[PDB]
Structures are given as C-alpha cells and as structure tokens.
C-alpha cells in the first residue's frame with residue numbers, strides 16, 4: 001500500500017562535523033560509486049510500491065540507500081566517517097538480507113561493496 005517515510009537527512013539536534021574523511025567519503029567514495037553502472041538501484045530509497053515488493057519493509061526495518069547517504073553528507077549530518085561507513089554497510093546488508101546469492105541485485109551489491117572497500121581502505125587523516 002505505502003512506503004515508509006524515508007530516513008532523515010537533517011537533524012538539528014544531532015552532533016555533526018565536517019572532517020577530511022567525510023569530505024572524501026562524498027567527493028571520492030560516494031560520487032565515484034554513484035557513477036557505476038550498477039549504482040542505480042541504490043540511488044534512492046527502495047520504492048516497494050512501484051517495485052511491487054510488498055514484503056520489503058516487512059523484512060527490512062532499517063532502510064538505507066546512497067541517495068540518503070549523499071544527502072546526509074551534503075548536509076553535514078555525520079560526526080565522523082565511521083557513522084557514514086555504517087550507513088553504507090547497512091545498505092549492503094539490507095540487500096543481502098532481502099535477496100539471495102546469485103540474484104542480479106546481489107551481484108550488483110557485491111561489486112559495489114568490493115569497490116567501496118577498495119576506496120575506504122585508505123582515507124585522509
């Protein structure tokens with residue numbers, strides 16, 4: 001019937017900072033992944049109504065996507081890099097939970113996750 005409201009992308013009462021690692025997570029890691037040929041399913045919240053996946057938000061109770069991440073980064077929502085990295089890992093984990101090995105979407109995630117890991121292996125100070 002409906003989608004849940006999307007995750008918040010601003011919250012005045014949350015502590016936040018710009019750090020060099022967070023600037024890098026947007027400029028390099030996110031904006032690079034974003035251009036990947038497999039990025040599209042992850043660029044916005046799962047529209048379970050459009051996709052006719054009525055079970056999605058029965059199974060996935062902490063939704064996350066790169067559009068939300070992008071907006072959090074642009075709005076300086078995070079206190080540190082680790083908070084953002086945690087949202088990427090929630091996004092990947094959700095994909096692996098809802099789907100099964102060998103599914104096209106899981107292969108897409110696996111690729112993006114490898115790339116993500118490659119890019120965050122070394123961060124700014």
Ligand SMILES: Cc1noc2c1-c1ccccc1C(c1ccc(Cl)cc1)=NC2
Pocket residue numbers: 040041042046047051094095098099104105
């Ligand atoms: C993210 C996400 N996690 O689970 C799903 C998605 C998804 C999200 C947006 C559009 C299609 C899908 C799809 C999807 C299914 C097959 C392919 Cl070739 C691409 C996308 N599956 C459900």
